């Protein structure tokens, strides 16, 4: 009744920073391997085998049981939350029934050789929210997971790669894994899903072995995969996923409209007109002339693009990111002492016929941080201040739109310091605010949106 | 029955290349400057007056009583072709009717005290659309115009900058005009039309004077203006405008979405993922950050936009722009020569009860060029070739959608042979071809469309 | 250069009443058939047939002739005005090159054996367009046109019936009509046009003829017909086209939602709940059911029903079809007279640097009559006071949104009394209002916007 | 652990037909008065006190401590869940903060004055869902509910009234009611929720009572209605509420469009053109007129109308409120017997490392029915035969697409068979198909979808 996984679980439970908890966790996730180790390294880079020698290792997080209650107890859809699929003699198809996923449904298929595989897990189990809620923080981009269950004897699906950073947890079962190098340069940390391949497409594996509970297989994307079961036993993996389209391309991709659009309004040259005549050698038609003006057309093309740099508003793109991946979030795992130093964990409640327990306001007197440090953002849209939050998401991505409030210019250094200085508590009397009026605003909208904690229980 | 106007038309007729009758007529525009005096100094940086000393200049290109003949025999309307306005006590008042601009109704306002704005003069004259449409060839932009016609003791119109190069032409009486220089650094070739402003708002004219018949002012976008008339006598003008939104920054605009597209897949630091922290760093919380990291973030972003310059479809950018240019374009202005050597001069009528003078077929001994020189761009566009020409555009602005007809990569050659040769003629068979059916085909093709002469009439 | 056209016209200029014209230019259309015959029994009944015995009669309305100078000299587009057209071995081609139908594509089509169909001879021709314009008054519905060309020994166009009421004018030429009575009672009168139709699918002709120039012939919608020219000559008609979803069941479409919404908001019994159970009875599973509840619920319908003839809004609805037909309307042809005393005769002008011949306002003492029948109506929408009018329209159907002005409620009965009187003049001082001020001021406006004329001009 | 409800629900729990369990639930609802009375002298005439004598009727169906635990275990929001009102000095109230609703902020509103509504109390509880679920099936309309909580001595909301019909169940503490006989004849049986009113428009009550626990207050929409909680007391309440939007008038909105389409289809006086001059006496400016044309107008409008009942499409539109109705529909509770005979109650499941208790296959010798009498209905739309289910709706309104699948007609006549036939078993080698291959396949697909169970458990 215990695995190495519940421990380490328990163990968050106790570190009081979520930085600190999420850090933790990916050192568990990986061990022995350390993380700086594998981030410098291996990440992106390299494909990575960690035989656990541990059967017991992930026990707790994800079961074929957890499954089959799932598709008693909640209403599963074939096609929105799981698939049943089957590769053979080189060719997929998925075979859901439209419509609600029975066990009865489900378990034919299952025995007819289809693999199944369950979309959003985190929605319906909180061992796998919990761990993808963790760590998501450790990623700065959202950690989403599926679960493979393939019966014996066969293969579900081709050999392709994705558009994530693949984690491979072996749950059940065994599998054999092959991957790959990717075949040219353009598939290298490739930015889309591949078509689904055939065998003569492949090489030679960097990498093929039989995978076991506990084991960890992981793989950039790019990385070309396939994985069968073979004798007689099945397998059950979660894999985890993130880093969809965080590149530097995509930076980019922000930043450059932006800076045009600056470097027009700000400098002259940007504003000048074109040659009058520039279409007589310019354009496909003259992708070959030698005329000399074309290549101090190139010339100054480069040098402005170049000059762009200097226009480019870094920072407000970052906070634009750091708002999708708010949207982005898992709702957070509280500690028992953050709920319980929270205003979820306040003992008002219904008793015989009134509510006890109105809790005390909070005061100058209080001592307070933010209850995590991965759940807000304060970001600036057009001379205003909001704060963007993660408390009030689904389990399911993008179910809620992006939430936030308002926060007036008068307490903005507040929020800022409060930001900034987690996990350290102060005195809402030393916020730097003008009255005391506005300190306690503050503080109170964000302990009563679930944002922040107090030292000692309001009551 | 004859003026300076007059003669330059007769000897654009006699001038067979439609590229040195663009030259010819703005240098009559401009006399005794020379262009290339006036595109290398006072274009896009200062106010130009020409004092022309030939009251007649102009005769014949539009005078009141063209517009009263307009007012009464086209369907003129309030709004969509005409505005009337007064400018009184520093206020700018609009009084459009809304419906027709008949005689009577245009005539009152006018009598109490309005300036009338005829938007779309070329519409309505065939000496204003060959005016325009002349020039626009050696502008490489789209040429517009109005007319303004001012009664005596009287402003139209409030104090502004116009977002265009401008050409003003004064046709009738006398004007004293006001041009001010560039306010500010941000104003100087503004990039969109200035508000109505005060006259506590300006500073001193660069320039004062009265204009008349027959005189040019020119000055560019940005630097504000504004007209009266002063005792006794009233005012027409032609105010003649390019370069809308036709600069570097416009160019790069397109360019960077393009450029960041083409490095990301073709190369991989741009594929490669963010920094899984950079949050901690990046944003409008940490302008003052010392981190080590942020400035060695925002030193990468400045050498990978500079890295696109590598990766800019300039000439892909170049087309596109070309072919805006074709839609925007008015359509061309025959001469006697080019009509009768085209398929607008076919002899082909119905006559008593059946067709007569049916033509000949062109042959490979048939000799041709283009009609015109700023007719037709062939521009590419997803692996295919396209044609477009300016010969089916209506004298209303994209009252026409772009036109264009496919060029096969078999006939790409000939058609890139007979753009860069106007006006030579080049025999049919002496076309780049894979066969002699090719080239009579290409030939056929584009002398059906209007975009072709022949050296002799086929009929 | 007379001919029984030119006369009618020359008569119809002498006719001061436009109710008269458009009735005497019917009678002359359907000479020596008398239009009160015609519209009792022949109109969407008969097939007719008048041999003119007069190859002049229509003389001056269109010939070849136009169609040349008007493909010539406007821009006459394939697709959009002209269509070129083959019927052989059964089969309808549609020939039409995209782009400008210049004559040598045209003639050479023709040459080919293409018929040619010129879709709004009205936009082009000045003559049709009066005929249209005067017709359109005494249909009550829009009065449309295509002229078809057909070459010698050759058919344009497959078997068909139309969804209007026809009449085909023979302008030059021969060709051999059969005219077939509807196939079935649902072909009868019918809503939309039919598809190409084999020999197979026709019975025996009703009629078919030679029709020679100055011949009439007239079929109603689902009536059809098949037209070829047949010995060495050449064909030209113009169809006059009309009443196209004119019908009482499209009057009662626009009724229906009024009436029940009425009658649900002014009576109960249509308020009332539903049967909770109908739905064990009701339904086509229960088609031949027995349940007396089914028809109870059957003959509650057909009471209900019947019962909203009392709320149905008719003449909001006239209001509507009418505000219509001002929309669809063609824009009025003055007579000589009309143009005097109205403000198109108006003599101001600009004459040597200045207007001239300013005309004297209206006073009290001007005598005062709608400029002519049909171009006007009052329609109330949403508790204000609309005329809707069709003096600004464009002879392009629709190239124009529909026209109104505010008819304020004090001016109210005037207006009414002018659209109820014409043509006898009214004093201005004689109008219905509250005060001189408001007989004046409603009276100018009408003038101003070409709605009125004046018993002797203003100047 | 033992109630009035408890006891019904546990009744409904051996009565083996669910139109009886509809039937018994309502019987118990308004115990003792008869349904039979209700309906016929009652629904929607009069409001109705059923002075229960009992405190302790509901005990089990909804509480306050409900309330609290779902706030505090569900994501409640305020808006989209929850409510807060406050009625004052004559004003409404709505006092939302944006966002989540944890007990902390929503007890200090409370307490603050503020009542609570829950709009979907049955998406979060599962007596409720039972309740309304079993009785929509007596309704033949969608039945909802709101749980209102007033706190001592406020009123939540001004007088109103709604558009539904309102079963008020008096749950906990006591609330003085007042009800209104509608005001004007154009309020009795109101189309739309009223405006909140003053207690000016009010009149004298018909009804004033204060209610008490166990107790029911009815009354028809558009009867006007506030209540208040006097001295010492807070008040618990479920609105129950149904009959929206099923009128009479409703029916015939739909029916009449495809009346009049199919009217001018199928008999040509409907497809006759209207006359060329109606509009000569036909609109407001001739409401006045004594034109004999008009008088025969409208009688032909109201012959015509009349005459649309033979061609009403009866049987269509009932079959499309049916599929608004199983789509507006509560998803159904399986008693134990049903779930124990269905595709539910298979105890097929995943053992230690395999799937085990793979039912049988059904044969020829099953004997089966339709799971319940209210969870489907056989529709036709463009010859094809669709069978609407709601055994997927969820508990929130809407939430799903109209769920279905096609009934093949070799099939149609079997699944007509069942639909028409239940509670009693038909064996599946009984139904009128074809072949066996259908008559398998027909109720194999039943069973699977949750639709049809057999005599004995497969397995
Ligand atoms: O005519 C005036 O008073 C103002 N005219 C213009 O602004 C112009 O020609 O561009
Ligand atoms: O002229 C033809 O061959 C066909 N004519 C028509 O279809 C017509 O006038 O309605
Ligand atoms: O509970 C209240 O105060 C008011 N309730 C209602 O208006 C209702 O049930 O319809
Ligand atoms: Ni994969
Ligand atoms: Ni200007
Ligand atoms: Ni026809
Ligand atoms: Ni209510």
């Not at 096609?79 to 590769?87: F, I, M, S, T, V």
């Not at 997929?92 to 007819?112: H, I, K, V």
């Not at 909180?126 to 014996?152: D, R």
């Not at 894999?239 to 930076?251: A, H, I, M, P, V």
Request: proline share 7%.
């Amino acid at each position: 009744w215990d695995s190495p996984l519940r421990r380490v679980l328990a163990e968050l439970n106790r570190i009081p920073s979520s930085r600190r908890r999420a850090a933790r966790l990916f050192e568990w996730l990986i061990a022995p391997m350390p993380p700086d180790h594998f981030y410098r390294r291996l990440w992106e880079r390299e494909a990575v085998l960690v035989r656990r020698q541990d059967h017991t290792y992930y026990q707790g997080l994800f079961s074929t049981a957890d499954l089959d209650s799932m598709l008693r107890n909640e209403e599963v859809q074939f096609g929105q939350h799981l698939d049943a699929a089957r590769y053979i003699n080189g060719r997929r198809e998925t075979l859901n029934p439209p419509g609600r996923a029975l066990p009865a449904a489900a378990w034919s298929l299952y025995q007819a050789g289809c693999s199944l595989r369950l979309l959003c897990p985190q929605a319906f189990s909180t061992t796998v929210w919990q761990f993808l809620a963790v760590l998501q923080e450790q990623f700065g981009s959202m950690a989403g997971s599926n679960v493979y269950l393939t019966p014996p004897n066969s293969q579900g699906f081709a050999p392709h790669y994705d558009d994530i950073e693949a984690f491979v947890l072996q749950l059940e079962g065994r599998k054999l894994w092959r991957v790959y190098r990717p075949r040219v340069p353009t598939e290298e940390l490739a930015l889309t899903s591949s078509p689904n391949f055939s065998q003569d497409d492949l090489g030679e594996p960097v990498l093929q072995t039989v995978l076991e509970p506990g084991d960890l297989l992981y793989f950039p994307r790019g990385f070309i995969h396939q994985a069968e079961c073979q004798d007689g036993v099945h397998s059950l993996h979660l894999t985890l996923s993130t880093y969809q389209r965080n590149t530097w391309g995509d930076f980019l991709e922000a930043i450059l409209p932006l800076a045009v659009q600056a470097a027009m309004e700000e400098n002259v040259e940007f504003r000048r007109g074109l040659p009058r005549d520039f279409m007589d050698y310019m354009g496909a038609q003259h992708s070959d002339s030698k005329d000399p003006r074309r290549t101090a057309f190139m010339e100054k093309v480069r040098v402005l693009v170049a000059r762009l740099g200097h226009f480019a508003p870094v920072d407000a793109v970052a906070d634009q990111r750091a708002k999708d991946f708010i949207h982005d979030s898992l709702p957070p795992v509280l500690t028992d002492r953050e709920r319980a130093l929270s205003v979820y964990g306040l003992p008002i409640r219904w008793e015989a016929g009134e509510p006890v327990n109105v809790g005390a306001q909070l005061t100058t007197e209080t001592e307070v941080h933010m209850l995590q440090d991965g759940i807000a953002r304060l970001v600036g849209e057009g001379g205003h201040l909001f704060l963007y939050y993660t408390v009030e998401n689904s389990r399911v991505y993008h179910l809620e739109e992006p939430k936030c409030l308002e926060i007036y210019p008068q307490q903005a250094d507040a929020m800022e310091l409060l930001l900034g200085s987690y996990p350290e508590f102060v005195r809402v009397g030393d916020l730097p605010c003008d009255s005391v009026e506005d300190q306690l605003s503050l503080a109170t909208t964000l302990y009563d949106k679930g944002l922040l904690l107090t030292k000692m229980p309001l009551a």
